[PDB]
Every structure is written in structure tokens, then in C-alpha cells.
Amino acid sequence: CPPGYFRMGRMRQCSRWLSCEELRTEVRQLKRVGKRVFLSEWKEHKVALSRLTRLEMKEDFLHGLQMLKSLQSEHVVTLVGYCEEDGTILTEYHPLGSLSNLEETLQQDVNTWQHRLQLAMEYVSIINYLHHSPLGTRVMCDSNDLPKTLSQYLLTSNFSIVANDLDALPLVDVLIKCGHRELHGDFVAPEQLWPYGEDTPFQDDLMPSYNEKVDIWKIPDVSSFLLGHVEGSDMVRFHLFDIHKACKSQIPAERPTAQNVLDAYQRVFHSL
């Protein structure tokens, strides 16, 4: 579709986004899931209706919407309509839900290492697109553990992955910092950890900023999750150890680009 247009289901042609007047009159709310998200319907289409919960985040809502508008692609959920006055956004609904439900969802004829590895190639394709997005290099900042990282992606009925939550996408080039609290653990990139030791208490203004290599650090965790434990999973992990080792490089500049990881994933896929 051209910019400003959507299409879903058996629609043969692209329709212009819905405006305040259509969301106000043509959308029947169904049941509450999940921004307060509602499963809804617009004529024959199940759609997601997110309403701004607290007016104090009117800018975290708008800049997520602007991010959603510019980044419409095969990697991002389909924007159907929005209304700035109501603080409301309409998107295409996906019954299979988050990437978190993957294991529950996969119990099928697509429960193979081939499909899970291609699922992993799809995840890296989103990261690669985000790093070369129309709005510049964007970082998926709200990925501090595995459940939260997967919660931001949806599984479509064709078993593809799309990014859904775009409310924490800062711009690199200009460095970035994911929040203003101290981050801990190993799921985050080590450059996201406080670098100055216990004798200097953490202080956000002294925390050095970083770039999009923090996304690369987290690829193996998501890819290993998608591979799961089916016949061939450990075979794929064997062939992915060294590329995942490069992703876990302590020095960010030594980590490969998302494009590199995808190329390696594709050579490993075809080889097996």
C-alpha cells in the first residue's frame, strides 16, 4: 500500500486510514485485552483499539503513533486508523497474540526447526528494518528481559512476526539511553550496565549513552527461544554458536550488523 493506506483480509485494494469520525461511529468494541487495548470489529475485520490510558503520556502516545505511521511495512502491524483527539489508535488484530505464546500456539505442521528458524530470520529482519527505518536507525529500547522483549511482537495467522509496540524507539544518529533507571543483569547489553562500580552510586547524567548494538546483543536470546526444543533445534544452535558469539561480543563495535546475522542465518538455513 502507498503511505497513508492500509489493507487486511480479503481486501483487494488499499483504503485510506480511518479518521476520528470512522473510529467514533463504525467500530464496535468487543472485549478488553492487553494504552488500553480492546479487541474490536470494523465491518468484517477484527481490529485492535488502543486508547491512551493516562493523559500525562500524550507525547509517548503520539510519538508511538508517528513511529507507527512512518514505519508501515511487512515488519510492522498494520495501522488502520487513529484519532488524536480521542487518544485512540486502530490496528489489525492478530488472534495468535504475542510471541510469548509461541510454544502454546505451536501445539501443528509448522512445529519444525525449519519454521522456527525462519521465524528467527523474520525477527532479525524486523531489527534490520528498524535500524534502517524511514525515520533513521531506531532502537527497541523496552527489551530488558525475554518476556518483555517478546511481548512487543505479534504472531500473525500466517505465522509471521510483526512489531507492535513502537512507543520506545529512540533515534541513533546522537546516541541513546533506554530510560533513566539503572539496568541490571545479562539480558541487556553490558554497555547498558552502570560502568563505574559500586563506589560511585549510579547517576543517570553520568551514564554513558550507547547505540543500536544493544539490539544485536539480544538476538541469540530471542532466536534460541524461537528454535525451542524440537528435533533439529540443537542442530541449529550448533551452527549458530559462533554468529551468536559475535552478537554477545562485549565490545559493541565488534558485534555484527543485523544484516550480517540474517545473511549467516540464511546460509545456515539453506545448508541444513
Tab-separated table of C-alpha atoms in Angstrom:
chain	number	residue	atom	x	y	z
A	1	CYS	CA	0.000	0.000	0.000
A	2	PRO	CA	1.023	3.627	-0.521
A	3	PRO	CA	1.825	5.760	2.539
A	4	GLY	CA	-1.380	6.583	4.382
A	5	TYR	CA	-3.254	3.470	3.205
A	6	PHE	CA	-3.947	0.073	4.766
A	7	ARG	CA	-5.322	-3.294	3.727
A	8	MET	CA	-6.182	-6.510	5.546
A	9	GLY	CA	-8.093	-9.711	4.949
A	10	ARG	CA	-9.659	-10.306	1.550
A	11	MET	CA	-9.479	-6.598	0.676
A	12	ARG	CA	-8.216	-6.327	-2.894
A	13	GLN	CA	-7.294	-2.626	-2.827
A	14	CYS	CA	-5.777	-0.188	-0.355
A	15	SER	CA	-8.139	2.045	1.614
A	16	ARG	CA	-7.192	5.324	3.258
A	17	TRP	CA	-6.671	5.145	7.045
A	18	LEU	CA	-9.729	5.666	9.240
A	19	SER	CA	-10.183	9.061	10.888
A	20	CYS	CA	-11.773	10.347	14.094
A	21	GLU	CA	-15.217	10.087	12.508
A	22	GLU	CA	-14.927	6.419	11.495
A	23	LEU	CA	-13.492	5.182	14.796
A	24	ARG	CA	-16.249	7.169	16.519
A	25	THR	CA	-19.069	5.582	14.501
A	26	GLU	CA	-18.071	2.361	12.695
A	27	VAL	CA	-16.105	0.381	15.319
A	28	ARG	CA	-17.869	-1.938	17.770
A	29	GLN	CA	-15.800	-2.703	20.857
A	30	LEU	CA	-15.871	-6.398	21.788
A	31	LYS	CA	-13.719	-7.405	24.734
A	32	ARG	CA	-10.812	-5.972	26.624
A	33	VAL	CA	-7.322	-7.411	26.224
A	34	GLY	CA	-3.731	-6.492	26.937
A	35	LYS	CA	-2.765	2.300	26.164
A	36	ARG	CA	-5.917	0.308	26.980
A	37	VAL	CA	-6.220	-2.244	24.187
A	38	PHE	CA	-9.595	-3.600	23.051
A	39	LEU	CA	-10.386	-6.336	20.578
A	40	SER	CA	-12.936	-4.698	18.288
A	41	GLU	CA	-14.579	-5.144	14.899
A	42	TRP	CA	-14.886	-2.888	11.853
A	43	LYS	CA	-17.324	-4.396	9.379
A	44	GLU	CA	-15.832	-7.833	8.730
A	45	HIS	CA	-12.409	-7.239	10.332
A	46	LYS	CA	-11.210	-7.968	13.840
A	47	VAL	CA	-9.180	-4.918	14.869
A	48	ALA	CA	-7.240	-3.739	17.910
A	49	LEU	CA	-8.341	-0.496	19.582
A	50	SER	CA	-5.759	1.049	21.916
A	51	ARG	CA	-6.938	4.039	23.946
A	52	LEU	CA	-4.499	6.327	25.757
A	53	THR	CA	-4.884	5.434	29.427
A	54	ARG	CA	-3.446	8.497	31.210
A	55	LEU	CA	-3.331	11.937	29.568
A	56	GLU	CA	0.077	12.558	31.183
A	57	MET	CA	1.703	10.492	28.386
A	58	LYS	CA	0.136	12.299	25.424
A	59	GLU	CA	3.594	12.543	23.846
A	60	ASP	CA	4.635	8.916	24.440
A	61	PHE	CA	1.363	8.050	22.678
A	62	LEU	CA	1.718	10.444	19.737
A	63	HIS	CA	5.362	9.633	19.009
A	64	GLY	CA	4.478	5.951	19.080
A	65	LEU	CA	1.731	6.737	16.570
A	66	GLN	CA	4.064	8.789	14.366
A	67	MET	CA	6.523	5.898	14.578
A	68	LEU	CA	3.682	3.555	13.605
A	69	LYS	CA	2.653	5.788	10.693
A	70	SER	CA	6.084	6.151	9.088
A	71	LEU	CA	7.204	2.547	9.668
A	72	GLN	CA	4.271	0.823	7.949
A	73	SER	CA	5.783	-2.228	6.247
A	74	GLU	CA	5.733	-6.022	6.288
A	75	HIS	CA	7.666	-5.850	9.584
A	76	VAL	CA	5.122	-3.702	11.466
A	77	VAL	CA	1.494	-4.148	12.486
A	78	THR	CA	-0.976	-2.636	10.019
A	79	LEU	CA	-2.281	0.792	11.021
A	80	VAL	CA	-5.991	1.010	10.185
A	81	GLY	CA	-6.907	4.357	11.733
A	82	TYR	CA	-6.322	6.764	14.579
A	83	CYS	CA	-7.793	9.827	16.259
A	84	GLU	CA	-5.531	12.257	18.099
A	85	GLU	CA	-8.390	13.964	19.955
A	86	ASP	CA	-9.668	10.699	21.446
A	87	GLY	CA	-6.152	9.359	22.023
A	88	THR	CA	-7.186	6.277	20.068
A	89	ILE	CA	-5.412	4.022	17.556
A	90	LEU	CA	-6.889	1.271	15.377
A	91	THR	CA	-4.734	-1.608	14.122
A	92	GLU	CA	-5.255	-5.044	12.615
A	93	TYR	CA	-5.934	-7.675	15.270
A	94	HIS	CA	-3.933	-10.905	15.492
A	95	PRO	CA	-5.627	-13.798	17.340
A	96	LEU	CA	-2.441	-15.794	17.991
A	97	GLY	CA	-1.237	-12.964	20.220
A	98	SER	CA	2.276	-12.214	21.378
A	99	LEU	CA	5.471	-14.063	20.514
A	100	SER	CA	5.368	-15.188	24.158
A	101	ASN	CA	2.531	-17.622	23.372
A	102	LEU	CA	4.637	-19.272	20.643
A	103	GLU	CA	5.066	-22.623	22.396
A	104	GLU	CA	1.405	-22.801	23.419
A	105	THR	CA	0.377	-21.713	19.914
A	106	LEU	CA	2.559	-24.324	18.177
A	107	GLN	CA	0.540	-27.234	19.622
A	108	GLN	CA	0.984	-28.417	14.294
A	109	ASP	CA	2.592	-28.991	10.897
A	110	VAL	CA	4.716	-25.840	11.358
A	111	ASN	CA	6.244	-27.087	14.640
A	112	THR	CA	9.560	-27.807	12.913
A	113	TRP	CA	13.061	-26.388	13.182
A	114	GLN	CA	12.707	-25.048	9.627
A	115	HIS	CA	9.722	-22.860	10.521
A	116	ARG	CA	11.178	-21.769	13.868
A	117	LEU	CA	14.480	-20.842	12.214
A	118	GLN	CA	12.585	-18.892	9.553
A	119	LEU	CA	10.702	-17.269	12.433
A	120	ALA	CA	14.124	-16.243	13.757
A	121	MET	CA	15.099	-14.853	10.350
A	122	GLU	CA	11.871	-12.838	10.489
A	123	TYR	CA	12.763	-11.386	13.897
A	124	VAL	CA	16.209	-10.306	12.692
A	125	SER	CA	14.548	-8.850	9.587
A	126	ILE	CA	12.499	-6.567	11.847
A	127	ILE	CA	15.628	-5.482	13.735
A	128	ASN	CA	17.396	-4.884	10.417
A	129	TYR	CA	14.469	-2.810	9.148
A	130	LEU	CA	14.282	-0.808	12.383
A	131	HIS	CA	17.993	0.007	12.107
A	132	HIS	CA	17.411	1.279	8.538
A	133	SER	CA	13.892	2.621	9.007
A	134	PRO	CA	12.404	5.601	7.136
A	135	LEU	CA	12.840	7.538	10.405
A	136	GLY	CA	16.504	6.567	10.735
A	137	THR	CA	18.097	3.987	12.991
A	138	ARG	CA	15.637	3.116	15.774
A	139	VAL	CA	16.361	1.013	18.871
A	140	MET	CA	13.833	-1.295	20.566
A	141	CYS	CA	14.598	0.169	23.985
A	142	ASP	CA	11.919	-1.641	26.016
A	143	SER	CA	13.586	-5.062	25.801
A	144	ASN	CA	15.182	-5.502	29.236
A	145	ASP	CA	14.219	-9.177	29.677
A	146	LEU	CA	12.979	-12.005	27.468
A	147	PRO	CA	9.230	-11.836	28.329
A	148	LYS	CA	9.090	-8.075	27.747
A	149	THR	CA	11.100	-8.321	24.517
A	150	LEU	CA	8.769	-10.943	23.046
A	151	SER	CA	5.640	-9.123	24.258
A	152	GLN	CA	6.316	-6.332	21.738
A	153	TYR	CA	5.913	-8.669	18.736
A	154	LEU	CA	2.758	-10.342	17.446
A	155	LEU	CA	2.272	-13.662	15.670
A	156	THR	CA	0.073	-13.381	12.593
A	157	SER	CA	-2.261	-16.144	11.435
A	158	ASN	CA	0.201	-16.966	8.631
A	159	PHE	CA	2.838	-17.473	11.373
A	160	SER	CA	4.830	-14.341	10.603
A	161	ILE	CA	6.167	-11.806	13.105
A	162	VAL	CA	5.329	-8.095	13.188
A	163	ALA	CA	6.452	-5.416	15.622
A	164	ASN	CA	3.547	-3.947	17.581
A	165	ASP	CA	4.821	-1.731	20.424
A	166	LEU	CA	6.726	1.250	18.987
A	167	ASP	CA	6.455	3.596	21.989
A	168	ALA	CA	10.147	3.242	22.992
A	169	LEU	CA	12.055	3.761	19.709
A	170	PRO	CA	14.743	6.432	20.204
A	171	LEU	CA	16.886	7.632	17.310
A	172	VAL	CA	20.585	6.890	16.766
A	173	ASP	CA	22.418	9.439	14.591
A	174	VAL	CA	23.081	11.322	18.610
A	175	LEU	CA	23.275	8.342	20.968
A	176	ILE	CA	20.544	6.748	23.065
A	177	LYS	CA	19.790	5.551	26.585
A	178	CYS	CA	16.888	3.190	27.303
A	179	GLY	CA	15.234	5.011	30.185
A	180	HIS	CA	16.729	6.798	33.167
A	181	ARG	CA	16.822	3.949	35.708
A	182	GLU	CA	19.831	1.737	36.288
A	183	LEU	CA	19.623	-1.530	34.357
A	184	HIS	CA	20.969	-4.831	35.670
A	185	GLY	CA	21.502	-8.396	34.518
A	186	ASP	CA	22.912	-10.024	31.414
A	187	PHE	CA	19.902	-9.874	29.079
A	188	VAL	CA	20.651	-6.197	28.498
A	189	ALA	CA	23.812	-5.309	26.634
A	190	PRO	CA	26.760	-4.804	29.028
A	191	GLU	CA	27.127	-1.201	27.833
A	192	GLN	CA	23.648	-0.677	29.318
A	193	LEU	CA	25.067	-1.539	32.755
A	194	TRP	CA	26.460	1.078	35.115
A	195	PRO	CA	30.193	1.157	34.286
A	196	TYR	CA	31.740	2.915	37.294
A	197	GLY	CA	31.482	0.304	40.056
A	198	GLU	CA	29.901	0.190	43.493
A	199	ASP	CA	31.903	3.078	44.990
A	200	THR	CA	30.268	5.636	42.656
A	201	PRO	CA	26.474	5.331	43.046
A	202	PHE	CA	24.613	5.207	39.747
A	203	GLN	CA	23.645	8.607	38.353
A	204	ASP	CA	21.748	8.892	35.079
A	205	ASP	CA	23.559	12.006	33.840
A	206	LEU	CA	26.873	10.146	34.214
A	207	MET	CA	25.571	7.014	32.459
A	208	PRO	CA	27.244	6.862	29.019
A	209	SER	CA	24.870	6.531	26.087
A	210	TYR	CA	25.025	3.725	23.515
A	211	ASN	CA	23.662	2.769	20.093
A	212	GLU	CA	21.730	0.047	18.250
A	213	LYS	CA	24.266	-2.699	19.026
A	214	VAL	CA	22.196	-3.319	22.174
A	215	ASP	CA	19.598	-4.929	19.897
A	216	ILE	CA	22.244	-7.227	18.392
A	217	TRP	CA	23.219	-8.386	21.890
A	218	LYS	CA	19.694	-9.754	22.393
A	219	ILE	CA	19.244	-11.622	19.082
A	220	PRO	CA	20.524	-15.025	20.354
A	221	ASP	CA	18.105	-14.977	23.300
A	222	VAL	CA	15.115	-14.446	21.006
A	223	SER	CA	16.424	-16.821	18.328
A	224	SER	CA	17.073	-19.579	20.873
A	225	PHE	CA	13.557	-19.037	22.228
A	226	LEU	CA	12.039	-19.415	18.759
A	227	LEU	CA	14.090	-22.537	17.993
A	228	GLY	CA	12.700	-24.166	21.136
A	229	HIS	CA	13.348	-27.856	21.788
A	230	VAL	CA	12.123	-29.789	18.751
A	231	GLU	CA	14.045	-32.221	16.558
A	232	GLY	CA	16.768	-30.140	14.921
A	233	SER	CA	16.729	-27.257	17.416
A	234	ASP	CA	20.084	-28.196	18.944
A	235	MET	CA	21.418	-28.846	15.437
A	236	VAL	CA	20.573	-25.251	14.512
A	237	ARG	CA	22.095	-23.963	17.762
A	238	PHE	CA	25.328	-25.808	16.938
A	239	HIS	CA	25.599	-23.962	13.620
A	240	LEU	CA	24.535	-20.654	15.221
A	241	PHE	CA	27.001	-20.680	18.137
A	242	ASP	CA	29.698	-18.556	16.509
A	243	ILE	CA	27.357	-15.972	14.980
A	244	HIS	CA	25.581	-15.767	18.342
A	245	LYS	CA	29.020	-15.487	19.952
A	246	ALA	CA	29.712	-12.446	17.769
A	247	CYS	CA	26.382	-10.967	18.886
A	248	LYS	CA	27.415	-11.426	22.533
A	249	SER	CA	30.684	-9.563	21.923
A	250	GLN	CA	31.487	-7.407	24.947
A	251	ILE	CA	32.753	-4.611	22.681
A	252	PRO	CA	29.691	-3.267	20.813
A	253	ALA	CA	31.604	-2.279	17.667
A	254	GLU	CA	32.758	-5.898	17.285
A	255	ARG	CA	29.147	-7.088	17.095
A	256	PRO	CA	27.778	-7.798	13.605
A	257	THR	CA	25.052	-5.765	11.993
A	258	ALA	CA	21.544	-7.184	11.827
A	259	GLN	CA	22.158	-7.700	8.104
A	260	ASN	CA	25.216	-9.836	8.896
A	261	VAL	CA	23.230	-12.059	11.268
A	262	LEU	CA	20.477	-12.500	8.673
A	263	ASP	CA	22.997	-13.455	5.975
A	264	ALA	CA	24.539	-16.030	8.315
A	265	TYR	CA	21.074	-17.285	9.284
A	266	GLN	CA	20.211	-17.688	5.599
A	267	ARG	CA	23.409	-19.583	4.770
A	268	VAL	CA	22.790	-21.859	7.762
A	269	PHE	CA	19.140	-22.386	6.786
A	270	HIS	CA	19.845	-23.390	3.182
A	271	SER	CA	22.815	-25.539	4.225
A	272	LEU	CA	20.765	-27.669	6.631
